[PDB]
Amino acid sequence: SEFGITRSLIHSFDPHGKHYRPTIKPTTGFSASADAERLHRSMKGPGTNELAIINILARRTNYERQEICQSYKSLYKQDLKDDLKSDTSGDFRKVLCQLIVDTPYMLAKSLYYAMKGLGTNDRVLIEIFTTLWNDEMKAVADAYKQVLKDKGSEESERSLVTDMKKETCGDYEYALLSLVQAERDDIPILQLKAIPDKGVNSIINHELAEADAKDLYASGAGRVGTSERRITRVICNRTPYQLYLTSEIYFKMYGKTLLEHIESETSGDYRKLLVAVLRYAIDRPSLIAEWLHDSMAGLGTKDYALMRLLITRSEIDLQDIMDAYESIYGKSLLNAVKDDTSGDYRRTLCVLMGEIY
Amino acid sequence: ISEFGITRSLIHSFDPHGKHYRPTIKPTTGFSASADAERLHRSMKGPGTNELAIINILARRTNYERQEICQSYKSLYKQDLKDDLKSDTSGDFRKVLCQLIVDTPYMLAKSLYYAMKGLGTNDRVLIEIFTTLWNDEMKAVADAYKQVLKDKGSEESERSLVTDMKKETCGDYEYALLSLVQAERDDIPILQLKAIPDKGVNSIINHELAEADAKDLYASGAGRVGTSERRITRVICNRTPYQLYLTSEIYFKMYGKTLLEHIESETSGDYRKLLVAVLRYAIDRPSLIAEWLHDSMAGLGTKDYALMRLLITRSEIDLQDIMDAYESIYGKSLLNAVKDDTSGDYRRTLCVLMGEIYNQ
């Protein structure tokens, strides 16, 4: 994998140092080989044993999935991704392809489709960029060049940045480019590992949050819109832990929540990006619950958001998101999904959420 | 008087089938600019502003009449109606009053200015406004914009509406947006428009053009990766509402998929929303604006100008038809939704625009 054994630990903890809860965790006694073989068995003769496939690929991490792919290749000298692609069809084949691909490639490909169609699917850009930290973003960028090649791009130096709108297009586009640069505030692995011990004071900074609050507060108004970067410089660079602190300080000081301030001072996609990044730090389960809810518009595989989100969030925080969703909507996420989808595609999603078949 | 002239352009005036759209505000055949001026003037004298009197005039006149009233009041009292209303009212009431006594094109230009001058871009507002302007209106707004820039400081005798917009290289949405602001959409001469109830919409559309357009529209899908696809933009943004409707019908008979569906599956982002807005402005307008009004009611008051902008503007064009659609769609009158989302003399002003007059 290009993402290592796990997504960045930066994503693993709520504002308070509490482990988010995934629906998928590395599999005790995992054997790529065992799984490769079992998958091989599940594709045979007329038809296919779909549930067998699901109960493996939808119960492993991206890293384990890639190990399986590598084991499969080694063994059968065949290609897992293809073997699946030939014996499945429709929506089920679609979700399987999103599953057997390395995460950064699966995201890079979505970014590719969001930009290369008619009109720019910014919702997807915002959705995906919000969820990547520096190293992941870099892996996604590299995956992107590989996607262009896989599409037969004859261009030597086409790139993610190359395909994106120019910073001069506006505040939103500049912020997007800022994030792609992949130079947000980072936390050493040591510190992150220790969050569930020392808590979070070690990785935040009051003098900083307080100063940033002052900057955030003084950013806005008209007459001067010449490169107003302060809001971007803070929201799009501070760690989720630091942003939370800034958020707390800002409300104590000013009497309006930092979120309300953003919603009031910015517009269009720029606002949507800022709101996404901030809520991903201070209000994530709800943010992604809402995203999931919006993704369910009876489109099936016509829109990828639903499966992209379930697949990715399954190994980070999908369970907390499931809980948020029910609180917000009165219906379990599991049921919303059962209602909006069908077939083996549906079964895959339910298993990703922890359902058993 | 008004850079829009006595009315909004007649090109907005008929539905796809040739029937007149129904406004909540029509030119008053007994209209006396001076008489209204006098009445407004009385309303303000003394420390007891009669809000109902003010609202029941200004919110019951077209933009042309309101401007006629401004002028008459100016010559009559050496005083500026706008100023006198501002100094005699406050809060949300003053806000809505200011949107109202300003010439439509200036009012739209100010909102465009704010949609761009701030942090990020209020594209929703650009789509909403540009969608609703035909060529001459657009040019009047462009002019008024230059006048907003002077009013707001700029000493740049050459900065304009297009200067402030995003460049066409920023993407399909931006390019399409710019094409509307180009103000080179197909025209229909007034005389032929006025004749529609006589001659029918058939006299004003082109079956052969629609077929050819329908084919170009369908082609925009194969080899979706080559050069910048502009054909959808050209057709959707330029055809008159009447031609687009015909194009929509013909497109469906040929391919068994609505033109809307086609657009919705082939395009994304603000580009889709702009195209969808423009198409629906032609073929599904009452519903389209009823939804716009619905989405504009989020309890923001005079912090979001969309609700009052839409009401003010649609009032003299097709607001009644939009009201019917609104209740069909949402199961509740637009009147009652508006009353629930607003209050004060502002609420009252909005209600009067839709026709609900309360006398004293």
CATH homologous superfamily label of the largest domain in chain A:
Annexin
Strand percentage of chain A: under 5%
Number of β-strand runs of chain A? 1
Estimated structural class of chain A: mainly alpha
Rg of chain A, please? 21 Å
The largest interface is: A-B, 33 and 35 residues
Assembly context of the chains: homodimer
Question: Would you give an account of this structure?
Answer:
The PDB classes it as metal binding protein. The entry lists the keywords annexin, calcium-binding protein, metal binding protein. Chain A is mostly helical and 357 residues long. The first copy, chain A, has four domains: 29-101, Annexin (Annexin V, domain 1, Orthogonal Bundle); 102-183, Annexin V, domain 1, CATH 1.10.220.10; 184-283, Annexin (Annexin V, domain 1, Orthogonal Bundle), CATH 1.10.220; 284-355, Annexin (Annexin V, domain 1), CATH 1.10.220. In chain A, 62% of the residues lie in helices and 1% in strands. In chain A, α12 (206-218) crosses α14 (240-254). The longest helix of chain A has 17 residues, at 134-150. The radius of gyration of chain A is 21 Å and the shape is globular. At the A-B interface, α10, β1 and α16 of A face α6, β1, α7, α10 and α17 of B.
